[PDB]
Design a protein around this ligand. Structure first.
Ligand SMILES: O=C(O)[C@]1(F)CN(c2ncnc3[nH]c4cc(F)ccc4c23)C[C@H]1C1CC1
Length: 167
């Protein structure tokens, strides 16, 4: 039993809710919140900009030190950093950005990072400003992630399309 509330169950291990991931994280304080990161951990907009703003820019300060030490992530890769006031940990995962011409097949590799964590609160990778089809992203999620994932979808219209079209 866990503290996630109001989710629709899609499969044995995947759950979905129309929610603001920032508000959901502040209420649940999950062990892991997933950020929709880029390789530079520059959290300017989308999910990343919202999560960072909610940390009063502490996420960005920590991220800049991480990059200065380690260099950029790989597309499809991840790193674990602090969850600040939102979660114990933040798993920064880089899905391909279609608006940068990155290979959509890397979306599966991105979701494989979730399997290193028993339970996660997450957005749909590569959705939103990353330019992928969220229906495709949900399919890859369900077919790749084996651990327990609670997906927060900000847009109510999109949440209903995702549910209604789910096979
Ligand atoms: O970055 C994008 O465009 C997204 F679509 C946004 N979306 C979200 N998902 C769940 N909660 C969200 N709260 C927010 C608050 C904001 F001010 C802006 C975006 C969100 C948001 C996932 C993200 C996709 C991986 C690309």
């Amino acid at each position: 039993v866990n503290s996630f509330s109001g989710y629709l169950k899609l499969t044995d291990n995947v759950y979905i809710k129309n929610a603001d991931i920032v508000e959901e994280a502040k209420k649940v304080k999950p062990t892991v919140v997933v950020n929709a990161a880029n390789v530079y951990l520059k959290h300017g907009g989308g999910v990343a900009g919202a999560l960072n703003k909610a940390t009063n820019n502490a996420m960005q300060v920590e991220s800049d030190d991480y990059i200065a030490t380690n260099g950029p992530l790989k597309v499809g890769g991840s790193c674990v950093l602090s969850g600040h006031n939102l979660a114990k940990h933040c798993l920064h995962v880089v899905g391909p950005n279609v608006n940068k011409g990155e290979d959509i097949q890397l979306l599966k590799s991105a979701y494989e990072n979730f399997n290193q964590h028993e339970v996660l609160l997450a957005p749909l990778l590569s959705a939103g400003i990353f330019g992928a089809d969220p229906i495709h992203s949900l399919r890859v999620c369900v077919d790749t992630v084996r651990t327990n994932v609670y997906l927060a979808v900000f847009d109510k219209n999109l949440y209903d399309k995702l549910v209604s079209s789910f096979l």
